[PDB]
Design a binder for this molecule. Structure first.
Ligand SMILES: N#Cc1ccc(OCCCN2CCC([C@@](O)(c3ccccc3)C3CCCC3)CC2)cc1
Length: 466
């Protein structure tokens, strides 16, 4: 409408008033996505984009939120004539979904930086005619709800978004773009992507949201950044309380990334009486294991990041090894570049810098160093093993000589007497390698003096020398 009951909480004068609105909406049949996204975008705008005049919290008046809401619903209802797309069965058709997609897409400014902060909400759509990639998918779902299309829902992989709809929720449709320089496939299914076993489509173990998970997504999408080195305390606190509200009601049960985002917020500013960040990261991993066949990479990356920030080197190495153990059962495809970048940065910047400090500290006389622990060496090896296995059978390679230099350097941070204590066992501290690259390397991993050239040859499969 809005409906009279959704209006009684206004004006919203504080973070806790916003939380009350979310709690009210979540206690309804169908939480109103359009309402909730407009409200979050309004409060983010005036807490992060333009704080001129700010004295405590940007008061969200009904009259303002209602006009924005009428702007959206009028644009959608005026442009989508439902009479042209009859619904057999309380479910939508592909043509109708495509039409809603076209409507949102065609409303967007023709040229803008698609990567800016704060263009994720319906507030940005209405006031700036700008949305980021997943923001367009969310807007399509909001628009569908506003039209009464109960069956259309958000689907999320770790780096892309689209919709599901139709008989039993079984149809997929692309509704937004992915990446840059990939021709879009808007209107099509995601079955080619699932079938090629790319990371982008998670071998089909992607999230299929209900309305409550869609609210969780908009909460994760809050962006507290004011600039490069400055976050809004107000938005961090709002995001955190909203995530706890969603947690308590059970709606983060099937959402690993949201649990990782909540753990990150708790690391930054812990809520008394709540679970530790670690407990939360592990719940993230448990959710991925329970609902998505343990096919998600970020639950382990979140955990590794925490361990890396706190210099638990052994635990960070184990969590990164576990990331590699997930990626190994994917094919590296065109459009998976975001995950290559994450692995590249870990291998080639983060781990070398961690091990460099570990080596200084060891010279200083640290006891129980990761560099003296052959289980740490084993995690390092398992990490490279899964990246090598990932590459096997993929339609493009992963490894090149730029990776070999870092490999050699990281191996050399462990003394030969530490490296020799890892037992590498065949199928069909002990480690088994899955990749042919690392199996051929086993001989080289123990020498007192690492044979650098030979390692390079083995990792890149370079056939010849100068
Ligand atoms: N070591 C280490 C490490 C590395 C990366 C890392 O990344 C955590 C952030 C993961 N990132 C996933 C994509 C995600 C997102 O960009 C996204 C998620 C799902 C589909 C599309 C986009 C947003 C979710 C809310 C709005 C979009 C933002 C969070 C953490 C630790």
């Amino acid at each position: 409408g809005l409906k009279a009951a959704q209006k009684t909480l206004f004006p919203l004068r504080s973070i806790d008033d916003v939380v009350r609105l979310f709690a009210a909406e979540l206690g309804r049949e169908e939480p109103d996505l359009v309402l909730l996204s407009l409200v979050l975008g309004f409060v983010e705008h005036f807490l992060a984009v333009n704080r001129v005049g700010l004295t405590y919290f940007p008061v969200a008046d009904l009259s303002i939120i209602a006009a924005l809401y009428a702007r959206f619903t009028a644009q959608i209802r005026g442009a989508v004539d439902l009479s042209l797309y009859p619904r057999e069965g309380g479910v939508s058709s592909r043509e109708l979904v495509k039409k809603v997609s076209d409507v949102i897409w065609n409303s967007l400014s023709r040229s803008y930086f698609k990567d800016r902060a704060h263009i994720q909400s319906l507030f940005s759509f209405i006031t700036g005619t700008k949305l980021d990639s997943s923001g367009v998918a969310f807007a399509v779902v909001g628009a569908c709800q506003a039209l009464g299309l109960r069956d259309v829902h958000l689907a999320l992989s770790e780096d892309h978004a689209w919709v599901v709809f139709g008989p039993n929720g079984e149809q997929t449709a692309e509704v937004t773009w992915h990446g840059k320089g990939n021709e879009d496939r808007r209107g099509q299914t995601v079955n080619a992507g699932v079938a090629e076993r790319s990371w982008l489509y998670l071998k089909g173990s992607y999230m299929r949201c209900d309305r409550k998970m869609e609210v969780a997504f908009m909460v994760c999408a809050i962006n507290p950044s004011i600039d490069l080195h400055t976050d809004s305390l107000e938005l961090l606190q709002l995001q955190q309380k909203l995530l706890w509200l969603l947690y308590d009601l059970g709606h983060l049960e099937r959402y690993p990334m949201a649990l990782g985002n909540l753990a990150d917020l708790e690391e930054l500013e812990p809520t008394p009486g709540r679970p530790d960040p670690l407990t939360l990261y592990h719940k993230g991993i448990a959710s991925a294991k329970t609902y998505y066949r343990d096919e998600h990479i970020y639950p382990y990356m979140y955990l590794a990041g925490y361990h890396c920030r706190n210099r638990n080197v052994r635990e960070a190495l184990q969590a990164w090894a576990d990331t590699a153990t997930v990626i190994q059962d994917y094919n590296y495809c065109r459009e998976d570049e975001e995950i290559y970048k994450e692995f590249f940065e870990v291998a080639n910047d983060v781990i070398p810098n961690l091990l460099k400090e570990a080596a200084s500290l060891l010279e200083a006389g640290s006891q129980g160093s990761a560099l003296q622990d052959p289980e740490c060496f084993a995690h390092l090896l398992r990490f490279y093993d899964g990246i090598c296995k990932w590459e096997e059978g993929s339609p493009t390679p992963v490894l090149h000589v730029g990776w070999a230099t870092f490999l050699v350097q990281s191996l050399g941070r462990f003394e030969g007497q530490v490296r020799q204590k890892v037992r590498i066992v065949s199928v069909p501290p002990v480690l088994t390698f899955q990749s042919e690259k690392m199996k051929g390397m086993k001989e080289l991993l123990v020498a007192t003096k690492i044979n650098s050239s030979a390692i390079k040859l083995q990792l890149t499969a370079q056939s010849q020398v100068q």
